[PDB]
Enzyme design. Structure first.
Site, PDB file in Angstrom:
ATOM      1  N   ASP B   9      -8.154  -5.533  16.762  1.00  0.00           N
ATOM      2  CA  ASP B   9      -8.434  -5.254  15.351  1.00  0.00           C
ATOM      3  C   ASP B   9      -8.684  -3.786  15.151  1.00  0.00           C
ATOM      4  OD1 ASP B   9     -10.699  -6.883  12.892  1.00  0.00           O
ATOM      5  OD2 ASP B   9      -9.308  -5.111  12.730  1.00  0.00           O
ATOM      6  N   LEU B  10      -7.832  -3.142  14.465  1.00  0.00           N
ATOM      7  CA  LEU B  10      -7.882  -1.653  14.321  1.00  0.00           C
ATOM      8  C   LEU B  10      -8.873  -1.234  13.303  1.00  0.00           C
ATOM      9  CD1 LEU B  10      -5.829  -1.730  16.391  1.00  0.00           C
ATOM     10  CD2 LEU B  10      -4.262  -0.394  15.096  1.00  0.00           C
ATOM     11  N   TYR B  14      -5.656   2.210   7.575  1.00  0.00           N
ATOM     12  CA  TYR B  14      -4.937   3.245   6.772  1.00  0.00           C
ATOM     13  C   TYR B  14      -5.626   4.554   6.865  1.00  0.00           C
ATOM     14  CZ  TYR B  14      -2.713  -0.620   4.181  1.00  0.00           C
ATOM     15  OH  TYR B  14      -1.990  -1.794   3.870  1.00  0.00           O
ATOM     16  N   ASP B 101      -3.018  -4.808  10.565  1.00  0.00           N
ATOM     17  CA  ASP B 101      -3.897  -4.242  11.506  1.00  0.00           C
ATOM     18  C   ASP B 101      -4.506  -5.157  12.529  1.00  0.00           C
ATOM     19  OD1 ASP B 101      -6.611  -3.616   8.980  1.00  0.00           O
ATOM     20  OD2 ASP B 101      -6.103  -5.397  10.086  1.00  0.00           O
ATOM     21  N   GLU B 102      -3.959  -6.347  12.678  1.00  0.00           N
ATOM     22  CA  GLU B 102      -4.521  -7.300  13.680  1.00  0.00           C
ATOM     23  C   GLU B 102      -3.433  -7.955  14.484  1.00  0.00           C
ATOM     24  OE1 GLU B 102      -7.579 -10.245  12.140  1.00  0.00           O
ATOM     25  OE2 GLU B 102      -7.985  -8.779  10.626  1.00  0.00           O
TER      26      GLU B 102
END
Lengths: 366, 366
Positions: B9-10, B14, B101-102
DNA sequence: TAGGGTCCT
DNA sequence: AGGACCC
DNA sequence: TAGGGTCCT
DNA sequence: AGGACCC
């Protein structure tokens, strides 16, 4: 870019399969019935006055002796139907089924391989097999005529093989796309074949008497086309693109208008194994909505062994109904149960709740 | 049968991508905005009081300086998102994306190959990488503890690689299924990782404060669960199967109740290339229903080069809308045009007719 | 219709 | 889930 | 919400 | 075509 397509159409399929089963019905006019209907019958019968889908009265009483055999249980028809497709797959892998008694095969690659094999001279000896639509003259220097004739030879071989290997007779039509192959396969109806040369494509398409006769146009489109004055194939060819575009949608419209000219670029699709297995029972009001759940175990019992049989297992079940329009309750099949009756039975039950005829469908195969 | 799953998970994705683009925003609190919203922001910003999805006022005015960068155009985020997934695919081919993002990766096969490689003794030296949820003690004789630790080591390697190769930081969680990996990946929020040993599975699941917090249960299910008195995860664990079965359907019901226990057998699915490409513009009422078709060419212009780019070409187009609920007009893309703007533009136009925000979707890729 | 089946929206 | 088309 | 996306019915 | 779920 030009194709050689064949459409193979089995004569009065269920009756063929029943006549192969009880030979004593060979000479005898034979009706296959489901509930109150004669869904099909052999030629004798048809001759002595019968049609696909008359009443077991308006038709028994329209005629003698008439033997009736029950065709509610589709099992043997369905098996013979796949025997036929597998046979045609052996000719060329890409075969599309349309119901249980029709198949399209794209013969393009096979025709070309044959022509390459033929040396310089015997090419002038290439002949037709079967009828030529409209009695049209062949031109051996036309490459397209030569391909469609080789295509009629593959077609006769397929029909010989379906007869020698499976005991079935049938019609075939060869043409340059699916619409035309299918339109031309029934020009010589009983156990024959026909080939369509390009120059007769308008003759065939104009031999139709209503646009409903064009495969691709069904009950609805037809009723709508009518509402606009379009009745003959030539009214549809000449109708206005726009007005049509802006009534049936661009998709529906611009496809059915090409059809009206005999143009149809849709590929023969490889059908392979089925995407679903289902069973059904009619009964003009006979589900007290309550008692009738036993019919539900019924259908499952058969299905389960079919679904089994396959290898592949279904990830979805679905139930369907009608009222004295249809309704369906869709739902995933619980993990571990894929791997018997008893769990299922009760998944189907509650599905029942969340809601003249009943069915179970197993789909989403993996 | 037991799995080792990681969920990656980032952090504030953005904003990471914008901070990599203008470095001068590195020290500076950064908001990414789309229209009126701050859809995300970097840590500085968050610290100085901001949240995913506050007003560019209720939030600009809630805080200083606040740099704003426009994130309406998703292009760079979407590219970086695929760079990340491709990197994780290199570890183990089966990676599932969840938004941009995951990613979930099934590490089962890779953990086992590693353990096989380790000889008899160094197995006692296997250690954890990162945090252990709930500070739970490890038992080196538990095979499941040893797998989840090797799994935390793969996870640290993935995060090191995403940092060294792509400049991105992120969290990871290792656990025995997707639900738990995802629940545990955010326990140490910023750029860290956590591993869930089985004995702490109830502690995690009961650390939730509402069943809405369970991935799998959304806005609706939650509102419905509430209507029945179910509010905590323990009310859902103890609620009655039947009553639940017979309210949410057997499917919805018997899946979300397993979730409430931390049980979740859903496989990590290989996402591969996307099943669709679309673009969008909001504008609280700004389509005069007439003028606004220029927005339509807009969206196409971008899309066309994306759809191109891919290789694969779309067989369907679709248009979508909202009102001062959404509506969509589905339609096949005409044959020859797949093979520019001008035809399309006008297919989209009539689609428009048959019908606060607008979009084009290209789908059914082949 | 009957008793199937398939693809699109 | 429902609509439309085919046999 | 915004601006994407995915699978089921 | 529309509903529900995810970020």
């Amino acid at each position: 870019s030009s194709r050689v397509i064949v459409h193979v159409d089995l004569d009065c399929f269920y009756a063929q399969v029943e006549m192969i089963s009880n030979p004593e019905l060979k000479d005898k006019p034979l009706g296959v019935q489901q509930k109150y209907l004669v869904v099909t019958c052999n030629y004798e019968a048809r001759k002595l006055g019968v049609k696909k889908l008359m009443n077991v009265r308006d038709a028994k009483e329209k005629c003698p002796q008439l033997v009736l055999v029950n065709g509610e249980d589709l099992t043997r028809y369905r098996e013979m139907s796949y025997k036929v497709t597998e046979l045609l797959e052996e000719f060329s892998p890409v075969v599309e089924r349309l119901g249980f008694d029709e198949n399209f095969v794209d013969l393009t690659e096979m025709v070309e391989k044959r022509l390459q094999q033929l040396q310089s001279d015997e090419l002038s000896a290439v002949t037709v097999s079967g009828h030529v639509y409209n009695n049209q003259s062949i031109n051996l220097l036309d490459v397209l005529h030569i391909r469609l004739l080789v295509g009629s030879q593959i077609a006769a071989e397929m029909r010989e093989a379906m007869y020698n290997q499976l005991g079935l007779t049938g019609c075939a039509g060869v043409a340059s796309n699916k619409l035309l192959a299918k339109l031309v396969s029934g020009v010589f109806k009983p156990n024959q074949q026909t080939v369509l040369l390009p120059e007769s494509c308008q003759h065939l398409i104009h031999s139709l008497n209503h646009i409903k006769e064009i495969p691709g146009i069904g009950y609805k489109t037809a009723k709508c086309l009518e509402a606009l004055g379009i009745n003959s194939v030539r009214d549809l060819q000449t109708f206005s693109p726009k007005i049509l575009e802006k009534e049936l949608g661009i998709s529906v419209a611009q496809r059915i208008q090409k059809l009206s000219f005999g143009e149809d670029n849709s590929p023969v699709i490889l059908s392979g194994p089925p995407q679903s297995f289902s069973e059904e029972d009619s009964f003009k009001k006979c589900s007290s909505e309550v008692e009738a759940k036993n019919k539900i175990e019924e259908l499952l019992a058969s299905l389960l062994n079919r679904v089994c049989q396959d290898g592949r297992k279904p990830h979805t079940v679905r139930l369907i109904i009608r009222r004295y329009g249809r309704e369906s309750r869709q739902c995933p099949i619980p993990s571990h149960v894929i791997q018997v009756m008893t769990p299922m039975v009760d998944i189907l039950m509650k599905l029942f709740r969340n809601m003249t005829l009943l069915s179970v469908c197993f789909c989403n195969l993996k």
